[PDB]
Design a protein around this nucleic acid. Structure first.
Ligand code: MG
Ligand code: MG
Ligand code: MG
Ligand code: MG
Ligand code: MG
Ligand code: MG
Ligand code: MG
Ligand code: MG
Ligand code: MG
Ligand code: MG
Ligand code: MG
Ligand code: MG
Ligand code: MG
Ligand code: MG
Ligand code: MG
Ligand code: MG
Ligand code: MG
Ligand code: MG
Ligand code: MG
Ligand code: MG
Ligand code: MG
Ligand code: MG
Ligand code: MG
Ligand code: MG
Ligand code: MG
Ligand code: MG
Ligand code: MG
Ligand code: MG
Ligand code: MG
Ligand code: MG
Ligand code: MG
Ligand code: MG
Ligand code: MG
Ligand code: MG
Ligand code: MG
Ligand code: MG
Ligand code: MG
Ligand code: MG
Ligand code: MG
Ligand code: MG
Ligand code: MG
Ligand code: MG
Ligand code: MG
Ligand code: MG
Ligand code: MG
Ligand code: MG
Ligand code: MG
Ligand code: MG
Ligand code: MG
Ligand code: MG
Ligand code: MG
Ligand code: MG
Ligand code: MG
Ligand code: MG
Ligand code: MG
Ligand code: MG
Ligand code: MG
Ligand code: MG
Ligand code: MG
Ligand code: MG
Ligand code: MG
Ligand code: MG
Ligand code: MG
Ligand code: MG
Ligand code: MG
Ligand code: MG
Lengths: 135, 109, 72
RNA sequence: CACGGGAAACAGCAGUGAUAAAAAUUAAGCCAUGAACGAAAGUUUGACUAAGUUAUAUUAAUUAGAGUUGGUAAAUCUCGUGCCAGCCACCGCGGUCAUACGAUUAACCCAAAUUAAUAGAUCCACGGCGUAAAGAGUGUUUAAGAAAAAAAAUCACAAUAGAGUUAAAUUAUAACUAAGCUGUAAAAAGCCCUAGUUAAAAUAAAAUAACCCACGAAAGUGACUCUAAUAAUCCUGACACACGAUAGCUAGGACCCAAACUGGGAUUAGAUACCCCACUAUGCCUAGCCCUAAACCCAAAUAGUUACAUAACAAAACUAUUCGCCAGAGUACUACUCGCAACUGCCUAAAACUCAAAGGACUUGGCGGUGCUUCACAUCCACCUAGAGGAGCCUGUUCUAUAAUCGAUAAACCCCGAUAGACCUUACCAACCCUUGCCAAUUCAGCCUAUAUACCGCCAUCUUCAGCAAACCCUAAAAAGGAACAAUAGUAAGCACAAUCAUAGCACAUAAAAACGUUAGGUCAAGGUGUAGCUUAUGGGUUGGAAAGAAAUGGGCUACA
């Protein structure tokens, strides 16, 4: 008839092989299509073991230097006045403005944190944004 | 075990066969002391004809008489052999029918 | 389940302790006897030694202590 | 051993006594080889050569008999037997339909052999140790080994030993006050030199913190303070060394409270127990022994990995180096040994013999004087009404009784087969009779003879219980299980339930219905029948008899006004 072993191979494997053995006398559509543009990974069954011991996953946490800045921003001023619009693809927040200013004053060569930070706050007050801070 | 431990004990050796009722001989010759009857064990019942024999090795032992019917009196010499009778607990020997004073079973007449 | 095994031993042990209580002074006698025997075989072992060495009497000042018959 | 001494030698070939399950000729030649001797021709040789004997084994043909036929494991039919007689290597067979006994018929398989008995050959672990046999109560070193690449020794907390101290209880003991106090599911016994309050040394034991997880090698350690203090530049390692819960022993001291034992009280058929009261050894301190625990986290130490990969259950699977252990179950934490301050001891640890299993985990049932929910509707308790059990009768059982039926006989028998026995009915008893003896025919009629544990027929019962069951599909395997509705693997025809029908309109009630199975439930005496029995009788007829109440009891009737 066919092969109901899900665990043994891919559907591709089992199908091709069952044709090979002359059991399955008609080639199925999806077969030719499959051969033509096969998937990236063979869809063979695999059992999901729980990890043990010292082993952990390989997944990298996502950070950028800007973050190192944003933290100081949020610690100081909390979330900004402008709220957030996660619908608007190009939306820039108050934090992001502060970031860009800080980066620009970094390019003038001031290596002190205080100078960069406060002067970026000033550069922002210039444009008309209010930093109410927090205690 | 580990390789050392296996080195230290040597390989395993097959224990010699422990010896039975006939003392490793195929038959024994013995004289009949008494003829009696024994009940089998529980699950299945009859009353089995046995005798007591004294054997050439001087050891005295219960022994069983095959076939239906027999003539055996004290002082008859018989020849006994090793088959153990499954019903009877304790009875490890069997009279050889057809030798010395135990004759072959007589067909019904 | 496993207790069946334990139970068996349990019984065995009980019955045996009981028996040692009944059979006690019989047992006393037999053990004292074995101790005397032991002491004797020991003495013989020693005597045998100083004789096979050609000496007649045991060497000077040799009392051959009583080790097994040692007071309880 | 052989000077000596027992004593008078076949373990040369044949023979022979004895003995054993065990059985070759008291034979012929030196012709060949070998050996001895000879210068040599040669002689001698039970070595040996050629023969004799024997199914011991092969082979060849002249020779056909043995074993087996329940499964393993090739092959069976009809009688006889009836848990008897007997059979089997192992499982097992035999209780009236035996392929398993015994014999016959057929077959199978070996074959001049075939079975049985006994010894071999072969066969255990380069496997395992949470739950099955097995990680040895703890650590250190010795011997012996591994080092095989990269590093490390180290800081809250209840280690251990000393010495000192005490908050909460409790108690000696007085002072008031009260007659009781104590004690249980309930009592009794005990105590009233008792109880409540107020005062209190000693002794012992260490709420809360702790929902913490520390210290120690383990056993163990959690009131407070101080002193001393927790090996190794860290692999494994004993039978050597040093420790080791509780209990127990010796000696001296303590004693609040607990308590084996014992004595009282209940309980019970008994109660040498559980429950109540008293009280002792003992639990404590000092010193010495003893060396055992379900000393179990039932999971060895040291380094590692999370790759391969589910027997089951459990605490997922594994590598390397080691050491300790384990070869069916009982017998056996036993008997004997050695050692030990142990003397009813610890340690070490068999065999005869017995068995064909013993074990481990699971599965579905059933059950549970187990827990939690929910119920019972004439139904358990609470409750309502009328009765039974006592009387007389009526009628049935059981007994006893007779020459004198049978059947039912917990629920699910007992005014039951019987909506029906004076003769008949009728099957029983006793006398008598009749033997192709109901019929178209029949070496045949006939049988209320045995078996309801061979049955059909009818039923009872769980039951006004809700399940049974074909055909499929699913499950890191399946013995079996298969639902989740905001749905997770189930679809299912069929039979039951349900619905309809009946009780002359609905409705309700009642009736009817109620599967698969359970009780080898009831009935060979409704009838019919399988198997086995009788045949001038276990068959067919006639006449007459079947009594009876010591006693026990069921159900009714009539009453007691
Ligand atoms: Mg039987
Ligand atoms: Mg036999
Ligand atoms: Mg003969
Ligand atoms: Mg026993
Ligand atoms: Mg000699
Ligand atoms: Mg001879
Ligand atoms: Mg000689
Ligand atoms: Mg002879
Ligand atoms: Mg022979
Ligand atoms: Mg002869
Ligand atoms: Mg010659
Ligand atoms: Mg010659
Ligand atoms: Mg001659
Ligand atoms: Mg036979
Ligand atoms: Mg028969
Ligand atoms: Mg057979
Ligand atoms: Mg037969
Ligand atoms: Mg032969
Ligand atoms: Mg074990
Ligand atoms: Mg351990
Ligand atoms: Mg132990
Ligand atoms: Mg005192
Ligand atoms: Mg009283
Ligand atoms: Mg405390
Ligand atoms: Mg250390
Ligand atoms: Mg070490
Ligand atoms: Mg101790
Ligand atoms: Mg003590
Ligand atoms: Mg004392
Ligand atoms: Mg005391
Ligand atoms: Mg007390
Ligand atoms: Mg008492
Ligand atoms: Mg001290
Ligand atoms: Mg412990
Ligand atoms: Mg252990
Ligand atoms: Mg170790
Ligand atoms: Mg094994
Ligand atoms: Mg054994
Ligand atoms: Mg012990
Ligand atoms: Mg012992
Ligand atoms: Mg021994
Ligand atoms: Mg009622
Ligand atoms: Mg009335
Ligand atoms: Mg009444
Ligand atoms: Mg009455
Ligand atoms: Mg009757
Ligand atoms: Mg009858
Ligand atoms: Mg009857
Ligand atoms: Mg019944
Ligand atoms: Mg009549
Ligand atoms: Mg009549
Ligand atoms: Mg009749
Ligand atoms: Mg029946
Ligand atoms: Mg249904
Ligand atoms: Mg499973
Ligand atoms: Mg199913
Ligand atoms: Mg269906
Ligand atoms: Mg109607
Ligand atoms: Mg209705
Ligand atoms: Mg009805
Ligand atoms: Mg209905
Ligand atoms: Mg019956
Ligand atoms: Mg009956
Ligand atoms: Mg009939
Ligand atoms: Mg009556
Ligand atoms: Mg009635």
């Amino acid at each position: 008839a066919g092969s109901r072993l899900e665990t043994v191979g891919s559907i591709f494997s089992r199908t091709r092989d069952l044709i090979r053995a002359g059991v399955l006398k008609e080639k199925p559509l999806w077969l030719d299509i499959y051969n033509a543009f096969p998937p990236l990974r063979e869809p063979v069954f695999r059992r999901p073991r729980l990890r043990y011991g010292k082993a952990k996953a390989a997944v990298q946490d996502i950070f950028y230097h800007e973050d190192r800045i944003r933290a100081k921003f949020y610690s100081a001023y909390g979330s900004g006045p402008k709220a957030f619009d996660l619908f608007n693809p190009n939306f820039k927040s108050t934090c992001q403005r502060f970031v860009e200013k800080y980066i620009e004053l970094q390019r003038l060569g001031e290596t002190d944190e205080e100078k960069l930070f406060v002067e970026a706050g000033k550069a922002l007050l210039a444009e008309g944004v209010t930093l109410r801070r927090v205690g | 075990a580990t390789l050392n431990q296996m080195h230290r004990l040597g390989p395993p050796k097959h224990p010699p066969g422990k010896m039975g009722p006939t003392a490793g001989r195929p038959q024994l010759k013995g004289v009949v002391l008494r003829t009696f009857i024994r009940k089998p064990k529980k699950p299945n019942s009859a009353n089995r004809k046995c005798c007591r024999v004294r054997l050439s090795t001087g050891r005295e032992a219960v022994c069983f008489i095959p076939g239906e019917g027999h003539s055996l009196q004290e002082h008859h010499v018989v020849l006994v052999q090793g088959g153990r009778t499954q019903d009877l607990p304790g009875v490890k020997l069997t009279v050889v029918r057809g030798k010395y004073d135990c004759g072959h079973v007589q067909k019904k007449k | 389940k496993n207790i069946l095994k334990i139970r068996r031993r349990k019984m065995n042990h009980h019955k045996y302790r009981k028996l040692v209580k009944r059979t006690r002074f019989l047992r006393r006698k037999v053990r004292e006897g074995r101790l005397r025997q032991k002491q004797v075989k020991f003495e013989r072992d020693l005597k045998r030694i100083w004789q096979k060495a050609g000496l007649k009497e045991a060497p000077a000042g040799w009392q051959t202590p009583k080790i097994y018959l040692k007071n309880q």
